[PDB]
Amino acid sequence: NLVKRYVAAMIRNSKTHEGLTEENFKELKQDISSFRYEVL
Amino acid sequence: RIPLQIVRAETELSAEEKAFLNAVEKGDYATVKQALQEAEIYYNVNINCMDPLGRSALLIAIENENLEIMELLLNHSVYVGDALLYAIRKEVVGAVELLLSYQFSEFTPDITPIMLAAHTNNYEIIKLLVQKRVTIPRPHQIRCNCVECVSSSEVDSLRHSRSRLNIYKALASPSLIALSSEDPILTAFRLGWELKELSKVENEFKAEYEELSQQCKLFAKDLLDQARSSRELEIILNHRDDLAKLKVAIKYHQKEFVAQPNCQQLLATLWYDGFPGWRRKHWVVKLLTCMTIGFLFPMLSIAYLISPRSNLGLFIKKPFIKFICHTASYLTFLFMLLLASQHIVRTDLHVQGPPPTVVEWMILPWVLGFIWGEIKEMWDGGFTEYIHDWWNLMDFAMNSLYLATISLKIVAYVKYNGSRPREEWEMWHPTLIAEALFAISNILSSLRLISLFTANSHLGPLQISLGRMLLDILKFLFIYCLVLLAFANGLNQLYFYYETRAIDEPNNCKGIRCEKQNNAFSTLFETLQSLFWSVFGLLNLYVTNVKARHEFTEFVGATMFGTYNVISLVVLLNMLIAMMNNSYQLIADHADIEWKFARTKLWMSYFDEGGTLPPPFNIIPDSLIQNQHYQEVIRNLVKRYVAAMIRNSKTHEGLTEENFKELKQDISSFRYEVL
Amino acid sequence: TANSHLGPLQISLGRMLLDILKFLFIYCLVLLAFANGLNQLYFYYETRAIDEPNNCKGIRCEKQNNAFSTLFETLQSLFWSVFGLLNLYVTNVKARHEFTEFVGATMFGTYNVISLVVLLNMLIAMMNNSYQLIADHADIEWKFARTKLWMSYFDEGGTLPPPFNI
Amino acid sequence: RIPLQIVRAETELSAEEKAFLNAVEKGDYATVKQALQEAEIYYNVNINCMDPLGRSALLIAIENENLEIMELLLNHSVYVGDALLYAIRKEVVGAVELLLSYQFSEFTPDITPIMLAAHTNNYEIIKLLVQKRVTIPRPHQIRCNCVECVSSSEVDSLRHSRSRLNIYKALASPSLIALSSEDPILTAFRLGWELKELSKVENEFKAEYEELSQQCKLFAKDLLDQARSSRELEIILNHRDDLAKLKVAIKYHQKEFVAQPNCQQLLATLWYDGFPGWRRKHWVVKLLTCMTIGFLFPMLSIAYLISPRSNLGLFIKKPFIKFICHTASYLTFLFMLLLASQHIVRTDLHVQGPPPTVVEWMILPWVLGFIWGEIKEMWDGGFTEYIHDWWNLMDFAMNSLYLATISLKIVAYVKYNGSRPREEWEMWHPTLIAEALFAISNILSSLRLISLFTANSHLGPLQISLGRMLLDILKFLFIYCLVLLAFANGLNQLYFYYETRAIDEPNNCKGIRCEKQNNAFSTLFETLQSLFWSVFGLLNLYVTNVKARHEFTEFVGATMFGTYNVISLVVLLNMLIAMMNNSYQLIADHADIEWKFARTKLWMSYFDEGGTLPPPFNIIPDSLIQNQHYQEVIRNLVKRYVAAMIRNSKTHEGLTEENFKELKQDISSFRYEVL
Amino acid sequence: DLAKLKVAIKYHQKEFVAQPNCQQLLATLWYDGFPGWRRKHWVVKLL
Ligand SMILES: CC(C)CCC[C@@H](C)[C@H]1CC[C@H]2[C@@H]3CC=C4C[C@@H](OC(=O)CCC(=O)O)CC[C@]4(C)[C@H]3CC[C@]12C
Ligand SMILES: CC(C)CCC[C@@H](C)[C@H]1CC[C@H]2[C@@H]3CC=C4C[C@@H](OC(=O)CCC(=O)O)CC[C@]4(C)[C@H]3CC[C@]12C
Ligand SMILES: CC(C)CCC[C@@H](C)[C@H]1CC[C@H]2[C@@H]3CC=C4C[C@@H](OC(=O)CCC(=O)O)CC[C@]4(C)[C@H]3CC[C@]12C
Ligand SMILES: [Ca+2]
Ligand SMILES: [Ca+2]
Ligand SMILES: [Zn+2]
Ligand SMILES: [Zn+2]
């Protein structure tokens, strides 16, 4: 139980503005490329 | 070769649940729908499937802030417990509104949604929750012997402490005070006082309670900071449940509230009542005016007695002139105390019981005035706060020594008739005790002037730091007294066998207060005196030498003396230097708020009518309208504060996340329009 | 360590005694150097206890005699000069050797300068810096020491006080 | 009523130029093209139009990082001067490559594109520029009397200083050293040394030159930090243009390079040559082994003389055993110096010229060994660095006092025959001067042991801080000596009229070194002595009292004495406390690199063959392959460093800007594909 | 009894020992005969 609680707290304390921002740009680029391929 | 395997194996779900969880995480209106239909028909997918890292389908849908998948999962009877708390902590309005419209957990079971909303300090979520008729359990009083507290602490102490801290953290949020309390200033004052007094009780969770108390004090100061007019500030400070709320804030030790610049402006205008623009004038003319008003201290007090409501009778009723007159009277008292020990007024020094001189006859009305003022201070104002001053102990010591001196003078006058030269008086003659106690009281009375340093702008923080470092002097004297007792015991035990008599020693002197210091360690009292005086270098080295040729005993005594000197100077004095330097460095940050609080407390002591006369002359014989005005002022202040706080909550991170969410939603909508 | 106010104080006392121990090495080296020099200069003018008044030979007399005559007495004199308990006339000899007296007084003054003005204020700076560093982690150390004191009374061994444990 | 108008009116362009500038800023392939065509035909638009806030069309096109508009403006003959610098400072590769493929300015006219590229420290742009055959002007030597420097400094000093600082900032960039220099370590060492020596010359621009020197030292340390093997580190440290590059780094005061952990590993393995795993053993067995090798100091030195290349002859050639033997010999010398002042070996104290005793006869070979070693140190190794030690002044003082003692003993032996009691010798007898100088040299020799503190791990930084605070003792004694001279002059001038004689004073004593202190301020020398001794409290208060009843003179003298005591203790000593506390606080950060540099410098003094014998016994009578290996090592180290630096240059801001640029370009391309 | 606490004391784990809940458990084991010793006044505690 203690290890599960600690790993959950640590794993979202690892969420950072930089990593979230990079993830959002990657998702936006992938979705825009998929939409462009659907149109083309 | 260290083998590495997962020792705590987690029961992984089937591959059919992985597809459902991936469809929930990626976001698909059709794949999740057909997966739920197949779960309903063929029972292929458990709807309440949960990730090993504490993430159910509803939690992931909350993390993606998409309301369509959340609505479909809510309509598909997904386990909804412990899911509103995640949306509250994530601080999104739409998901909280939707879940309010209807195993492992990251939250302790004592957390309610309103408590987590108050912990997160989001105004919109707290307002939306408190609209739904929510309540917070009342924390108990600090000292409980009741069954409901004692049994709960005995069964589960950690849960009890966590629940109390969580409740007090929920109650201390500025948004909950601004919404749920009709008097946010008094609520913040009271909560800050309870949290400060509870930090000392629960000494292990001291930092969190101190932080919450500081948060409440900051909220009260920031609520006062939004005043745009002097009328609003006067309504705030005069609100009675003259300056009532300021006195309440002084009672609750709200130093940040008191030292606010507009409060200090109002106090300064009330202080310089008869001087419009005292800070405008030159320092020379200010000193001249102060000197004139001080030198007019026989005046403006007889005029108050003969005509209280005349042109001149109201002059001393102003606070600054009252302070100047009191200071002038005390300085005149100290001047007569200085004059009392002069040859011009003191003659015939060989009488056992003397009548009082003219200077002591003039001193006596001042002493009676001080005694009567301290007696009146016990009754008027109250007794439970008279001892809560730490300056009244000094005044009590002065008045007790004055009374002892007067009584001893009376006894020595009534039982000793005649004359006798001073050398053949006894050791405990009442006259000698009277002269000793008078001198001690003179020292105390002249040292009483330190309390006036808070009025000045340069000597106030200096006295604040003096108190700060005397608090560590008090800690240092314990170690020093233990070391002194140890070495005094050892040196007296070694040296008491070689005690001599006063007759054998030259000049009939036995002690360390002679020209040739004798019997420094013969008795325990003299050993303590010698080891005290050796700190200042006033104890010579030959006091460790005995008459006989016992060189080993002399060497051991000199070694004890050297070890004591090393310990008590080289270690301890420089340790005290380091301690007081560190304490001064810490207090130098918060050194002007403390001085302004002390100066305010000194100023309000001269505002009232009680004690207008100086101690020389003090022995001569509708509420609804105010409540509604305060309510409008509080409404305006709370609205201004919540607007300032709500856009000060705008942050680059949150704005950036909002812009990505809006861009993703708009791109998805445009793609759906094209497709 | 049991008390809440004198515990971290004793922790800091140990922290700064750890630097007292470093400082006494330099001080003892300086003391040995100046003791060697002063004894070498002054040992030729050693007197006897009979010739000196009150049959006293040493610095623990009313008139301090033979302060630098022997190495042990030179060490004692240079130790006691830190607290100002060594008078200035101990550098004066019976004969009219003013150059020897001047060189001895110059050694005494140089030792006083080195051992007080440089070294004591250096020790002040060292202990102030060490106190400033330890003042951050001063409550965890006290709680560890208080815990170690508490677990020493938990066991059954040593229940009786030392009057009654025999 | 303060009127507000623009006092510095800027000539605004016509409305036709605003359309062109807005079309350039917004980005349009067609509007800018037709605007340029209309400017060519109808002359409606000035092509070289410039914004009031220093922004031409080409500069805005650079700021938008779009190459199509830049290419069209380049083909349309837009003024291209002072535009490559903006693209270099913006750090975009494409615009710099395009402008390299062919009024008001924000850059000073002495800045070249390569200089700005080196200032920005971008590896790709610097490489692309240096491929185009670019050069940097060579800065002159620091001390120039030539016409080209003196005339330029006289005509325009600010431009000259700015140009020199810009050139030295361009030369100090790590990328330019990594590309243009074949020996980046030696180049970084040399540039750091010149910048450090030039910061003291140009004392006004000291911070920038110190920062550049620190940057060069950091680059050298970081280039050494990329070594992945001991062979590479040994190739780096042994490269000669044994440890040659380490000696060069010690010469250039590269403390960060020297105190690198792998360099310290290699030095520690070279230091414990005969002890594999000295740090592994217990401290007790280490102390026992050190004590045994130290006590064997007559041994291992005779064996070196009789058989240098035997099993035992090579034992002292190891550095640690050599250090232990030298320390043991010095401690034995100090032990004999202690024994020289004892009654067991010193008798017959009433002879004018004595023959030397057995202890002094044993002392003499040690003194001759020290003198011969210091003489050899002047010749061997060099003379220009012998004075650059600050410990050789102490050794010179010791040897001069030893020579003076020996010569005075010889003179007193050859010219004084017979015996005479010590009280009737003269003031300046050569024997007495010999005994005084021997004692002073004993003090110096015993205080010489402080130099061994850098070997120990606990007393090294302590001695470093001791030097740090002696540097401020030296500053404090100037003010103290000025105050001492002032008060000595005043007190002697006041008190010299009441000078007595030695006969009139008791015990025929005239001075402050008596039982009753007499004539404390009679002479200037005695006044200086009295005012010095009053600091330690050894001057009594009655020395300010004169024989006559001149109470005004005595009061003025006592007031001068009290003012001197206040100034010299209460102000000055606590000022010195504050100064040394501040200096210790600053040096406590960089206190371990200094100690490691000093310990390294002590270690390399025992590596060489010179001075192997202790002072008791030292008077008894192809380069191409190495260059190519170093070149491969430098190639690998520079590649590793540039990779680590080039992705350590990746930043959230730059990555975010790159992602927006890529997203905008892809969205525009998709829109053009749809349209 | 407290075995892991003794192990942490042996390994000089000062942060583990000075944790607030460990200090609560140690304080309840220390004031065995005084339920609420910190609750009382300092005068009655001294008496
Ligand atoms: C240095 C020696 C000569 C001092 C002797 C004792 C007294 C003559 C001094 C000591 C403390 C002094 C007091 C310190 C502080 C103040 C407050 C000061 O208040 C103001 O300036 C008024 C405006 C305000 O309240 O801010 C007026 C002078 C006064 C009473 C001073 C009057 C003179 C006092 C009593
Ligand atoms: C200043 C002079 C008079 C001191 C003379 C020596 C003794 C009388 C003193 C010195 C140290 C004192 C002790 C310092 C610390 C403590 C721990 C303190 O512990 C508590 O408060 C109990 C709760 C807890 O363990 O936290 C109880 C008093 C006691 C034993 C003190 C008792 C009185 C002592 C032995
Ligand atoms: C406190 C009193 C008794 C000191 C008397 C003087 C000497 C006996 C002391 C003073 C300085 C001491 C030295 C200080 C530092 C060192 C370096 C130290 O070096 C090491 O530990 C070897 C490994 C390394 O080089 O790091 C060996 C002892 C030694 C020579 C010490 C030997 C003993 C010395 C000479
Ligand atoms: Ca009072
Ligand atoms: Ca040398
Ligand atoms: Zn309760
Ligand atoms: Zn030149």
Numbering used by the authors:
A (entry chain D): 719 to 758
B (entry chain A), D (entry chain C): 17 to 118, 135 to 273, 286 to 665, 705 to 758
C (entry chain D): 498 to 663
E (entry chain D): 286 to 332
Copied sentences from the primary study:
Like many other TRP channels, TRPC5 is permeable to Ca2+, with little selectivity among monovalent cations, and functions as a thermosensing channel. Here, we present structures of the human TRPC5-Gαi3 protein complexes using cryo-electron microscopy (cryo-EM) and demonstrate that Gαi3 can directly activate TRPC5, increasing its sensitivity to phosphatidylinositol 4,5-bisphosphate (PIP2) using electrophysiology. Remarkably, Gαi3 binds to the ankyrin repeat edge of TRPC5 ~ 50 Å away from the cell membrane. Electrophysiological analysis shows that Gαi3 increases the sensitivity of TRPC5 to phosphatidylinositol 4,5-bisphosphate (PIP2), thereby rendering TRPC5 more easily opened in the cell membrane, where the concentration of PIP2 is physiologically regulated.
To elucidate the structural features of TRPC5 prior to Gαi3 binding, we solved the cryo-EM structure of TRPC5 in the absence of Gαi3 in lipid nanodiscs, as all the previously reported structures of TRPC5 were in either detergent micelles or amphipols. As a result, the obtained cryo-EM data yielded two structures: TRPC5Class1 at 3.15 Å and TRPC5Class2 at 3.59 Å, with a major distribution for the former (65%) and a minor distribution for the latter (35%). Considering the similar particle distribution and structures of the two different conformations of TRPC5 in our structures of TRPC5 alone and TRPC5-Gαi3 complexes, we concluded that TRPC5 can exist in two different conformations regardless of Gαi3 binding.
